[PDB]
């Protein structure tokens, strides 16, 4: 199972690298945007932040197939093995196709459906990102499409991942845990709040309390 | 899992094979009927269309085991590697039997219920085709009639596959992958519905704007 | 229950009004669009061609909620107990609160996801109309959507029914049936196949054989 | 609960309602045909072999909405209070609208799906009688049928009952009263096979033996 | 609830009635052979033996209609009030409606199925008894065929009871009284393993023993 | 509903009767053993402990029926309206006919069984007490007991009321209100685990440092 | 899967052997019976309107172990490789053992119950005979019963297969299917229902209209 | 699956053992209490009986674990490959793990709860006797912890078998074997009961009757 | 599957170790300071008194991941293959990560949820610890948590095992072993429980009266 972080804050990421067995950080046009760093300096940070272990991926902007593995051969040029988000779209759909035949490994995202999903990974695909919380958000179910997804890939493309992504609670990162998915990318304040919790707080103060009381001292 | 189009409009063909996965396509007399374009002219151009790659199936027109064994042959005669359509009647049966023993891949086509479907596979069919919306319009469950299909076929012939086919909306494509089907065929306007969505392509706009706002362009 | 007709043809709507028991037809802005004719002159011609009796239902072209109340103003000029279909927006729900002010009956239209459906119930809507399978074709599950609405509905605004619509085959809407459904609204091509049936013509044919063959003819 | 028998053989409805508790007979067309007997002469032998009291049911031939209330009322003529069997079409349907406000009872018969038996109770009929064999035979599911049925009869129109027919089996027969149907019709073989078990034989016989054993006799 | 004990043995009925709160005795003929007392004898002895309360049930012997109404009054001779087993058999149904309309209240017995028991109700059975055991052993469910006769009793024949009968362990008692039964009867040993546990006499004992240690006693 | 405390700890009572909103006290023979104190000086103790309000609850020691219901008559007299808890046994439940018939309101404990509890009821018992735990320690289902006793006594005896007791942990009190206990009992370590959470204090905290943050105190 | 027809009309055999693909025949004493020809006359008959391929079974008479096995001797020498069919009775069971360890393979049959049915194949039998519409009609659940003993085979004697018999409707057959049957021997009427579909017909029927109003011609 | 009967009859067993596919023979020493001779006699007698092949099943009466140990010896000294039934208490426990290393095989016995039989599994026993009867009598359910049982031997003991005993009725043993019990062992009145039905008997006489009708006899 | 006892009471492990199948002790804080005996005593006398077998855990006391590092080195110093417990906390999981880099085996405990839990798991932990009571005392479930975070391992971090803990009933134990705990720790009090049953003394008391009225005494 690969943990991966939702972010472009390199401080951040070195400081959690040490605390999370991550594979790697994931990024997308909004995250790049609001840390408002250009991708051949971001990239590398993050690469470097996590001690030149752990995957890179990141997204295309263009909008024709053929643009898409432009941008791919940018990426690559910057990372040399990161892994190529492409929206999941006609041309999209495209490109993978393309990327595939190229040897790009890449991942197919703004997920919406199953069916969707699918198509990417039978098109080359090898990771595809649901985006749960949007799905959640808009009426529909992010656990069940996430579910389905899995259960699609693993009858009809085997060899691609689910990448599961957008969260907003940590619940939702379990529910896709439970289904199956065999990657994840977290947001930072849904990942510090799934290892922080009052109760496991108090079940330490108490060992503490204990352990004090009776050898008059905290420390072994 | 094979992906099919169900169709004999050769340009659409074209532009579609450059996006889907296509593992080629299936034709009905109804559908070659709309296309106005006889046998020997219309498979020809499907074939191509695809890149010389890719399966084409088509169905036979006579009613008698021994017509039907004839029309089979006259099928071969324009693509050699065809996969004959053959509906699962009494005669149909008998006429699958038959091109088993010539070594001729069939196809159990208007498949209406599931033990139907059976026989045709235990008869020596490759491909056992459930026509899903006809059986939910007539007021039975095709989702149900699939899933039993699938089901009996990998418990009882399972050398045989599912082909999903005849279909309104990509929901009924959904709950027959999630029902295990190893191939499917889809209409033009299902499959393009099953690519096409408004969430995703707000959500890649989202993806734009915030990354002009940021840099100032949507490029890269 | 109410059973409506979803469509602007008028000389189909008075031939299926002696077969269908009909409360009444059901148009939108794309309805309307496609039979060509304006308001002012389908509607009353509607409302002749089902008896003089049951409901109508037509919807406002405006964006904001001033604009939608003189939207239903305009429709009742020409259909006095007309029902005003409010797209549940922002803008939408605060029309349907002045609406029930002015004591005019609304459905709440464009309804995607089951709390949103609410919403309108709560604000005022008479009717709350899902878009089955739009849902559907979208990649989520209009039948959970209009299950859970259904729920939502006499759990918590009892007043309120729910007016299920867009359908491409009749099993979405046996399932909306099934789920509770209160009223409900066919496009012309559903409803006819929810009347005909090859396996009834054929149990019919065969009462007339056997009648035939005892009695020397097929009437009474 | 209504228990009818599905019969036009006048000494066996004599002989068997003895023994059953009947609420009448139901017919149709291949049933009287063959019992060759015409209906004006075994209606009324039927009505008096089950003592005058219990309704009778018999099928219109017409083809037409207007030819079928002819027959409706040439029916009456014989029966006085006769409910009329009208096939669930698109002119059956126009048929049972016009026999509702003629304030003639009828039953909507030949049918095969759900959706179809709701609209028969919605334009008036009491009763609707699914051919829960007949759905088996031909690849769907006559219990689910009926299930789905009387759920739809108890939501959308309350004063309608299904009325299961059709029966190969007493098992189809025990479900369809599971599933909550308010009358039933069973062929003469079902029901005899529904009132004599070995098993049972076998317990009374035990009884005897045992009585025997200790008394002398079989008797007391 | 109405509990009943399924014995002829007088004295230990007498015991047993002060300790558990019986609404009466049931018999049959291989339990009244088994006691060796005649009916005119046992009945009135098991009547007083309750302190005159609590109702009897006893069956008929004859395999004719007839002949069974016949036993029906020869049995109420010697209890007056007394209500009438009768196999439900195809004469014995015919008896059923008979006594119903004499006004002699009767059980249908020797039931080994649902269907046939909902018969026995629809014809006049105030009660009817399932042999659960005895479907057990033959290869069927015991329970399956109570919960759906109490089922189809209370959706059916709504004034009927379900009776349950021939336990071999309290764990069927337990599984006919979760499915609903208004009624059982018990042989006596089933009866005292249900008032007879290890556990519980060790939770007495526990109790005692704590009493004695702080108390020096074991009395109040 | 009825929620008690299963104690002779006049301290905690007086302590916790603040707290929760009891309906009273229960004890038991080891209770009351522990407590060290007899029971004319303790009842009075609890009873005023707890206001003068709400009700008492304690056990007979004797082992016959009449013995038990001597014990009752000097419980009364100590305490004039207390409620008799009589253990679940053949002469527990002949004492339990007998208390009904001289209206003294009893509870039927030490129920390890769902069919032992309902007996109790059928005799006159108003509460039913099972032991869960017990029931649980000993490799059964607590749960399951106490959920199908409820039934039995809802569907069979329904003026009794289940009165669960006997617990090590909240999860097994909380899912004896889940299956419908209409009152329950608890041992104070679990009273007080049911409302003393760590995340509970860490979101009052965090309410305080909050207030504190922005108006210079944590008083209102 | 093995598909058997339960027949002795060898000329039927010849004719459905063409159409559905059989593994062979089976025969029981009435349906020989119904026939009229003895054993050493139809046996080598329907070996021969097979073409010699497909077992064949037949049944013993005796009522001794010894006897059965002798029988079993009789059938060998008509068909050398003809599996005999027993009777699951006491006797049956000893001579299963016998004819087990003399290397002669069986079937047992007369299977009501699923117990029953595994100590056959315990004993060696290589096919369990449920009789299906039987358990139906006798108020069991023939379904129940299949699906039982299938799973009992498979986790206890997983050499023996489930032969499914005794059919009223091929919805019985579907679900003996579905249950995992991994063989089936039907009635011709069932055999016949179950390739015979009024909208398969109808399906049929409109492609060639669909063919001839493109083409002018309903040939290929 | 290993199939024994519980008893030392050892007459029964030699009839039986010709009957049914016995893995052997189990005694307990209740059972061989009642059978009157000591185990010197009657274990090599049972041997003979089922003929020399044939797993014996003897229990220890000591109440430490070196006495059960010494109990064991003796044991084995009668039959060389008996397999010993010890008790699953804390002596007992001990016991197991002290035979396990002597490599004397052991059932673990008197198994009331899941994890108790688990405990005698991890502690070296091959087989393990919940009381499945004893469980029900005693207000439990028998056959849930039977599942439960099975479950956890084959997730955490998987060399242990599960075998069940203590039986009233044959759909207890049922139950067992549908829960996956790899062994079983039953009393002979249940053993009787499970290969003697009415239904059967009937069928075979039906068979008998029809074989008369065609060819003037009963036999082949 | 490994079974531990969680406690520092050397004598009861002496003693205990010769009844249960144990793999071990646990220890934990509160455990140590309970026995108030230092690590550096009672972890030799716990490892003597099983015997020199058997795994040993024990906990870090530090708050950093630098400390806990340092802790564990100290408990490995005084037993040499011992299971270093840490919290799994922030500074916990950075730990564990250390731990697998020096080759030293560690335990993920206060574990209240199962994405926590996980986490540990992936970090490099081998076992992972719910604490099971504490979460069912705090309103939550353990057996969900449990059953989820085994889920969570099995798919996710195959070669981590869940060992359960804090257990207040010997039920909460069960169903952590039915959900497949590979691994679990009882307290004394519970682990007592789980071997001592009044209803299984009892049946051994039954089969010694049974052996003594047949034999003169009650050994072998």
Redo the contacts between chains.
Sequence with gaps: ?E?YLDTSDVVAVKALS????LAGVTT???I???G?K??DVVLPQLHEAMGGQGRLFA?V??TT?EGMVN?AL?LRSIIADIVVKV?????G??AI?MLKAEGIPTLGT???????G??SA???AEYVAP?VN?IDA????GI??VT?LH??LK???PQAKVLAASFKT?RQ??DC??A?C?SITLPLDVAQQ???????????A???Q??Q???GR???
């Design positions: 199972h943990l040490r605390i999370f067995p997308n046009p909004s790049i945007a609001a408002k250009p991708l997204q902007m263009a197939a941008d940018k929206p999941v779209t006609a041309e759909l495209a196709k703004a997920v919406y459906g199953a069916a969707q699918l198509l039978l098109a080359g985006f949007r808009q009426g529909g179910s069940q499409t389905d259960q699609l009858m009809h493309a940590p990162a379990l845990l439970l199956g065999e799934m290892i922080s919790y009052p109760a496991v707080d108090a079940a330490v108490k060992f503490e204990d352990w009381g009776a050898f905290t420390s072994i």
